[PDB]
Each structure stands twice: as C-alpha cells, then as structure tokens.
Design a protein around this ligand. Sequence first.
Ligand SMILES: Cc1cc2nc3c(=O)[nH]c(=O)nc-3n(C[C@H](O)[C@H](O)[C@H](O)COP(=O)(O)OP(=O)(O)OC[C@H]3O[C@@H](n4cnc5c(N)ncnc54)[C@H](O)[C@@H]3O)c2cc1C
Ligand SMILES: Cc1cc2nc3c(=O)[nH]c(=O)nc-3n(C[C@H](O)[C@H](O)[C@H](O)COP(=O)(O)OP(=O)(O)OC[C@H]3O[C@@H](n4cnc5c(N)ncnc54)[C@H](O)[C@@H]3O)c2cc1C
Ligand SMILES: NC(=O)c1ccc[n+]([C@@H]2O[C@H](COP(=O)([O-])OP(=O)(O)OC[C@H]3O[C@@H](n4cnc5c(N)ncnc54)[C@H](O)[C@@H]3O)[C@@H](O)[C@H]2O)c1
Ligand SMILES: NC(=O)c1ccc[n+]([C@@H]2O[C@H](COP(=O)([O-])OP(=O)(O)OC[C@H]3O[C@@H](n4cnc5c(N)ncnc54)[C@H](O)[C@@H]3O)[C@@H](O)[C@H]2O)c1
Lengths: 149, 149
Amino acid sequence: MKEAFKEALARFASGVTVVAARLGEEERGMTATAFMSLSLEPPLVALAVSERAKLLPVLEGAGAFTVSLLREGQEAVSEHFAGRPKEGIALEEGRVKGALAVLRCRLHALYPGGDHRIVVGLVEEVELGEGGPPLVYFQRGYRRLVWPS
Amino acid sequence: MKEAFKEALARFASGVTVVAARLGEEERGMTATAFMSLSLEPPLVALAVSERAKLLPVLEGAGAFTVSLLREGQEAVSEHFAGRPKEGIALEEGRVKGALAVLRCRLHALYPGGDHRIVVGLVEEVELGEGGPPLVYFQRGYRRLVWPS
Ligand SMILES: Cc1cc2nc3c(=O)[nH]c(=O)nc-3n(C[C@H](O)[C@H](O)[C@H](O)COP(=O)(O)OP(=O)(O)OC[C@H]3O[C@@H](n4cnc5c(N)ncnc54)[C@H](O)[C@@H]3O)c2cc1C
Ligand SMILES: Cc1cc2nc3c(=O)[nH]c(=O)nc-3n(C[C@H](O)[C@H](O)[C@H](O)COP(=O)(O)OP(=O)(O)OC[C@H]3O[C@@H](n4cnc5c(N)ncnc54)[C@H](O)[C@@H]3O)c2cc1C
Ligand SMILES: NC(=O)c1ccc[n+]([C@@H]2O[C@H](COP(=O)([O-])OP(=O)(O)OC[C@H]3O[C@@H](n4cnc5c(N)ncnc54)[C@H](O)[C@@H]3O)[C@@H](O)[C@H]2O)c1
Ligand SMILES: NC(=O)c1ccc[n+]([C@@H]2O[C@H](COP(=O)([O-])OP(=O)(O)OC[C@H]3O[C@@H](n4cnc5c(N)ncnc54)[C@H](O)[C@@H]3O)[C@@H](O)[C@H]2O)c1
C-alpha cells in the first residue's frame, strides 16, 4: 500500500544527509533525505528520524547531533549509513569528512511525527567544505545536477 | 547576518513546492522548499511556513492545504508564489496544474519552529502528473538534473 504516496514523494528531489550523534561508547550515523531549513532566528533545522532508527535513542540521550550534507561522489557514504555496509566508511569528529557542509546542532526540540520523530536542531557550529555539486536523490535513485549553470 | 548558516543551507538541494490553502474564496499560495516526507503510517508530510506568511492564517483557518511539486520549467510558478508576481499564473482546484504531483492534506498538527511554524499534513488525496525531471533549487538558483534521453 501507499504506492501513490510513495510515488508522489519519490518526485520530491533532495540532497542527502548523514545525521549522527554520540552518547558514551556509542556513536551512530544514519542517512536521511528528510531534512529542511527551519528558522533563521534562531538558526534551526528540522529532520524526520524513524521511530525504529537505532540512531534515535542515541541522539535523544546525547542532546546534540551533527548533519553532514553529502556532495556528488559520496553515494557510498549514503548507502553505508542507509544500512548497506561499505568497506572503510566512518565518521570523523562526529561527522562525515569531505561533505559540502556540516551543521553541529544542540537538540532544540522533538515532536511526534507518526512513524517518525520530528527532530529540531539549534545550529551552534557550521563547517563548510569546498564548493561543488551535491549528492541528490530523486525517483528512487542517486542523481547529479547539470553543473555549472 | 547568519552568513555561514545560509551558505550551508544553500548547499542542500531540494525540489520546489507551492503550498496553498483556502477559506471559501480566499485562497493563498506560497512557494516553499522546506518540505519533506514525514510518515508512512499515517501518511504525513511536514513543511516550514514563516510566521509572517499570509498563507499561515488561512491554512490554520482552513485546517487543510495542498502541496504541489513543481517540475522542470516551472520557475515562473515558483517566482510568482514566492512574492514576485508573474503573468498567467493561478491556482486551479486549490493547487498548481501540471505539477509532478499534488498532495491534498488535512492539517494534522502545528509545532513551534523558531520564526517558522512546522506544518504537518495528513495526506488524504494524491494526484500525479506526467513523469519527467523536477524543478530543483540549489546554491541560490534553479537547477536541472542530469536526465538525458
Ligand atoms: C536515500 C535514502 C534516504 C533516507 N532518508 C531517511 C530519512 O530521512 N529518515 C529515516 O528515518 N530513514 C531514512 N532512510 C533509511 C534509513 O537510512 C535506514 O532505515 C537507517 O539508516 C537504519 O538506521 P539505524 O540508525 O536504525 O541504523 P542501522 O540499521 O544500524 O543502520 C545504520 C548503518 O550505518 C552504519 N553505521 C552506523 N553508525 C556508524 C558509525 N558510527 N560508523 C560507521 N558506520 C556506522 C551501520 O554499519 C549500518 O549499516 C533513507 C535511506 C535512503 C537510501
Ligand atoms: C526558492 C524559494 C524557496 C522558498 N521556500 C520557503 C519556505 O520553505 N518557507 C517559507 O516560509 N518561505 C519560503 N520562501 C519565501 C516565501 O515564498 C515568501 O516569504 C512568501 O511567499 C510570502 O508568502 P505569503 O504567504 O506571505 O504571501 P505573499 O507575499 O503575498 O506572496 C505569495 C505570492 O503568491 C501570489 N498568490 C497568493 N495567493 C494567490 C492565488 N490564490 N492566486 C494567484 N497568486 C496568488 C501573490 O501574488 C504573491 O506574490 C521561498 C522563496 C524562494 C524564492
Ligand atoms: N524519510 C524516510 O524515512 C525515507 C526517505 C527515503 C528512503 N527511505 C527508505 O529507503 C527506501 C527506498 O526509498 P525510495 O525513495 O528509493 O523508494 P520508495 O518508493 O520506497 O520511497 C519513495 C519516497 O517516499 C517516502 N518514503 C518512503 N518510505 C518512507 C517511510 N518509511 N517513511 C517516510 N517516508 C517514506 C520518501 O520520501 C521516499 O523517498 C524506502 O522504502 C525507505 O525504507 C526512508
Ligand atoms: N525556508 C525558508 O524560509 C526559505 C527557503 C529558501 C528561500 N527563502 C527566501 O528566499 C531568499 C533567497 O534564498 P537563497 O537560498 O536563494 O539564498 P539565501 O542565502 O538567502 O538562503 C540560503 C538558504 O538558507 C535557508 N534560509 C534562508 N532564509 C531563511 C529563512 N528566513 N528562514 C529559514 N531558512 C532560511 C534556506 O534553506 C535558503 O535556501 C531567502 O533570503 C529567503 O528570504 C526562504
């Protein structure tokens, strides 16, 4: 079921992020396309994390997390943090190295979201990688932007 | 202000949507990139609408709204509903005709989101348009996806 809903959302293109959190001995990363800018004042971003995600309890307990925006060529990173292991993929300094950008957030608020939890982060630090095209997901596949334009 | 934050978010590619609501014959439309799939069961989507958006009052009052996913070549529609009026642009049946897809939602919840409000919609109807490339926004500009024949 939900074929129509999925076909519709498959038609919404987006960049790809890796959301990560560290709580004690555990540090987890998870691939997420459900990400969006939320506020400028204060600087907030919103994400939807599955209630079934192992990342969730870690992020909740940590009270802070990072969001790395993947660039073109990082499909392997996305696949790895999406549950399809790739050799040698790892987080460095709590985030994805070589990403277009990294947002280090303090957990600002959480809200119910059906089978997902709405996670709101207050951006406290911003890391900017070198400019370039992003990793894009649209219609059930990784895509590239016609770049430059 | 918030130069780094803006630069980072400009690095998150996304499709472009037009959110609309109506109270009788008073109908408002607003361009938005802050949109994401939220839940499958129930089928929910989330978006961020500025607290100063004229659309918000109507959306709350209506308790329902639509989200149209724009396709490649609809930059004019995006600009129009972004506050820069264009010729011959109008909502039809409460949404944008000729879009990749339209989601007709019932307002499910409203949560605090800084200078924006988190709008959660319960998808009650889905409309799909012809297939094809989407309208993408990235690095302060409309972009096209590599999608050759
Ligand atoms: C394009 C795409 C977009 C997606 N968007 C979303 C979304 O917006 N929201 C959502 O809830 N789900 C999304 N998913 C699915 C989601 O990624 C999987 O359901 C989820 O990753 C499983 O995550 P988990 O935290 O439960 O961890 P696990 O099931 O354990 O999966 C995490 C994977 O990441 C690896 N990993 C975890 N931590 C580390 C670490 N510290 N170092 C190295 N490797 C590590 C693991 O080896 C494992 O394979 C998306 C999937 C794809 C393919
Ligand atoms: C690429 C892009 C992405 C954006 N994403 C977001 C976002 O995610 N969230 C956000 O809050 N803001 C976003 N904005 C800015 C936002 O679009 C403007 O702040 C907002 O449109 C002003 O909305 P308003 O509802 O107050 O209406 P207005 O300032 O009145 O703007 C709405 C425009 O739509 C037209 N319009 C309204 N109703 C109708 C109708 N029934 N028929 C025909 N035309 C109509 C108007 O003529 C007007 O020009 C984005 C802007 C751009 C350029
Ligand atoms: N937001 C998410 O939770 C999310 C986003 C994309 C991918 N995924 C996972 O990857 C699989 C493949 O995705 P695809 O886009 O290639 O094909 P798909 O047809 O399974 O999904 C199409 C779109 O529908 C939405 N969606 C699908 N499953 C969802 C879920 N469980 N919760 C919320 N939204 C969902 C997402 O926007 C997804 O991109 C999905 O079935 C899901 O397991 C999860
Ligand atoms: N989510 C939003 O509210 C949103 C999204 C994009 C565009 N816009 C409007 O269009 C203008 C141009 O944007 P641009 O991307 O071409 O260059 P920009 O540098 O002005 O914006 C960069 C990115 O930061 C985020 N952002 C910017 N202003 C925001 C705001 N007021 N609230 C929440 N997030 C914000 C968005 O993701 C935007 O794409 C922005 O200044 C803004 O007025 C608003």
